[PDB]
Amino acid sequence: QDVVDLDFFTQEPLHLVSPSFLSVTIDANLATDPRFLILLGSPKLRTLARGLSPAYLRFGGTKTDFLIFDPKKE
Amino acid sequence: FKNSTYSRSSVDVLYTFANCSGLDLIFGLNALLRTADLQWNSSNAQLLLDYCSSKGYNISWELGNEPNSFLKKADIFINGSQLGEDFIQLHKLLRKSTFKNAKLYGPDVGQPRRKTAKMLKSFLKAGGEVIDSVTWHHYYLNGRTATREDFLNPDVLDIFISSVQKVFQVVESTRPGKKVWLGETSSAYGGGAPLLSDTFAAGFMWLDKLGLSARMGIEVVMRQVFFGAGNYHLVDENFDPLPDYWLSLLFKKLVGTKVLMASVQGSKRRKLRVYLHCTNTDNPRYKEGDLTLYAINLHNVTKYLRLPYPFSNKQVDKYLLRPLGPHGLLSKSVQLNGLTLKMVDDQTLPPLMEKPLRPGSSLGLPAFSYSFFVIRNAKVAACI
Numbered sequence: 001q002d003v004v005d006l007d008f009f010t011q012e013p014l015h016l017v018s019p020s021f022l023s024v025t026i027d028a029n030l031a032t033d034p035r036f037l038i039l040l041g042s043p044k045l046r047t048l049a050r051g052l053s054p055a056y057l058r059f060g061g062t063k064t065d066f067l068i069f070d071p072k073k074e
Numbered sequence: 075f076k077n078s079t080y081s082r083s084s085v086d087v088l089y090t091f092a093n094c095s096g097l098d099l100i101f102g103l104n105a106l107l108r109t110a111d112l113q114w115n116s117s118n119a120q121l122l123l124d125y126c127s128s129k130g131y132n133i134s135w136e137l138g139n140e141p142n143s144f145l146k147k148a149d150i151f152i153n154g155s156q157l158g159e160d161f162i163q164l165h166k167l168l169r170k171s172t173f174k175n176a177k178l179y180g181p182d183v184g185q186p187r188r189k190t191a192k193m194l195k196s197f198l199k200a201g202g203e204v205i206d207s208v209t210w211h212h213y214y215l216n217g218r219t220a221t222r223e224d225f226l227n228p229d230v231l232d233i234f235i236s237s238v239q240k241v242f243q244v245v246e247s248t249r250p251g252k253k254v255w256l257g258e259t260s261s262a263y264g265g266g267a268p269l270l271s272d273t274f275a276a277g278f279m280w281l282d283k284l285g286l287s288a289r290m291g292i293e294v295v296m297r298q299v300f301f302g303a304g305n306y307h308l309v310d311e312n313f314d315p316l317p318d319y320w321l322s323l324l325f326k327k328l329v330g331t332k333v334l335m336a337s338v339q340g341s342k343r344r345k346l347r348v349y350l351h352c353t354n355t356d357n358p359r360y361k362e363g364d365l366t367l368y369a370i371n372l373h374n375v376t377k378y379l380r381l382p383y384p385f386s387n388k389q390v391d392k393y394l395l396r397p398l399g400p401h402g403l404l405s406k407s408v409q410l411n412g413l414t415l416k417m418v419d420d421q422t423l424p425p426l427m428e429k430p431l432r433p434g435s436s437l438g439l440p441a442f443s444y445s446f447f448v449i450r451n452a453k454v455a456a457c458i
């Protein structure tokens with residue numbers, strides 16, 4: 001037999017998640033790719049990104065702790 | 075891993091991408107910049123904060139990634155107490171900046187092994203007052219050794235439950251009521267499992283992680299990665315969406331912020347996994363009071379789900395996801411109710427089309443599949 005009965009608790013919310021509950025990362029190592037500007041400039045990628053709004057975008061990764069900001073760089 | 079520099083240009087590309095996509099950027103700062111006596115040297119951060127202020131960028135911050143493994147990665151050990159003090163110093167810098175109300179999250183520790191739990195607890199004692207959410211990371215498997223069977227194994231899925239409980243034990247003991255975020259998470263570490271992390275089979279883990287996170291009190295889950303080198307990407311190198319992207323989109327369109335509970339009657343809760351939320355109110359088709367059930371079937375046969383009173387006769391919409399062949403669960407293409415999901419063009423996501431079921435019918439869930447079901451006119455007051 002492959003029929004299964006479900007029980008539902010519906011009296012009150014048990015938790016409240018953020019509207020941004022499903023969020024995403026971009027690994028900090030992607031900033032070392034020579035093509036970073038082309039990649040994040042892609043209209044196609046931006047369209048896919050917009051689809052997941054609202055969401056946090058975490059820029060971070062193992063490389064976070066090996067990245068130094070240089071105001072002089074081109 | 076070696077030090078590397080990044081430019082004002084790189085910052086602008088990142089911010090622009092986030093801002094034009096309706097995403098809220100969180101930027102991780104380098105925590106391995108230490109002084110003589112191993113305090114955090116904040117001066118490089120200052121330069122970045124100054125630049126972002128001048129450009130008027132609205133950004134949230136983190137400091138460090140997986141500090142539990144700094145000894146392995148950089149041969150430097152930073153304990154949790156010190157790390158907490160470092161966050162206190164960043165918090166002072168943010169408060170003196172033009173966005174003095176910017177959010178700060180941390181410490182982005184790995185899953186709670188004994189040594190990591192200790193670091194997290196000492197960090198929350200020291201620095202827990204100035205963080206807006208506690209971030210930690212979780213992975214099920216090693217991408218090098220993960221198998222297909224591992225991706226389908228309820229015992230592997232179940233391991234996440236204990237990690238969540240352990241994190242909440244640490245948090246309740248130090249900063250009770252502080253929000254808890256998964257700050258980096260995926261199927262498998264080391265960049266993902268080749269030919270598994272980018273397939274339909276990846277969805278069993280991702281959808282279950284979402285369900286459990288929401289059910290257990292995790293407020294935000296951050297998927298490693300949206301786009302990137304790792305196989306666990308939502309979007310591949312051609313800017314094409316993989317099955318987890320489509321699952322993530324569907325999840326977002328259907329699932330509301332109020333979390334409820336579902337469970338299956340009987341001693342076998344392992345292979346049929348069920349979650350229940352209020353329906354996302356911003357969805358134009360549905361109304362206040364509707365419910366969104368989602369279910370994963372890890373059995374090798376179809377199961378038929380019966381809804382309890384008083385929902386047993388309601389109109390239900392099905393949103394069943396199944397792979398496009400010939401590669402089965404290892405497919406990188408997915409069908410929604412038998413229609414392949416594909417972009418309409420570079421600017422246009424397709425509509426996500428429901429399949430209305432006969433009122434009073436049991437909900438069919440084929441073997442090795444996942445589906446959402448919206449119960450229309452459920453009239454649940456907790457959702458309204």
Ligand SMILES: *[C@@H]1O[C@H](CO[C@@H]2O[C@@H](C)[C@@H](O)[C@@H](O)[C@@H]2O)[C@@H](O)[C@H](O)[C@H]1NC(C)=O
Nearest residue numbers: 001002342344345346372373374375376377
């Ligand atoms: C199918 O799975 C079996 C174990 O699962 C149980 O039996 C099947 C037929 C379903 O009723 C399921 O709900 C049960 O939990 C295995 O013993 C069997 O080898 C599997 N068949 C295959 C791989 O062909």
Ligand SMILES: *[C@@H]1[C@H](O)[C@@H](O)[C@H](O)[C@@H](C(=O)O)[C@H]1NCCCCCCCCN=[N+]=[N-]
Nearest residue numbers: 027060061062063139258262263264265266
């Ligand atoms: C998170 C990290 O920030 C990313 O930059 C990595 O690309 C990502 C990944 O590995 O794909 C992820 N790193 C997680 C590292 C977890 C390793 C766990 C090792 C467990 C060994 N001991 N035991 N048991």
Ligand SMILES: *[C@@H]1O[C@H](CO)[C@@H](O)[C@H](O)[C@H]1NC(C)=O
Nearest residue numbers: 107108109110115116117118
């Ligand atoms: C902090 O870093 C800068 C640049 O690396 C260095 O010149 C400065 O002396 C450091 N400060 C301390 C207190 O070590």
Ligand SMILES: *[C@@H]1O[C@H](CO)[C@@H](O)[C@H](O)[C@H]1NC(C)=O
Nearest residue numbers: 111112152153154155156196
């Ligand atoms: C943690 O490290 C700091 C800085 O090196 C040190 O002074 C302190 O004694 C350590 N704390 C504990 C609890 O061991």
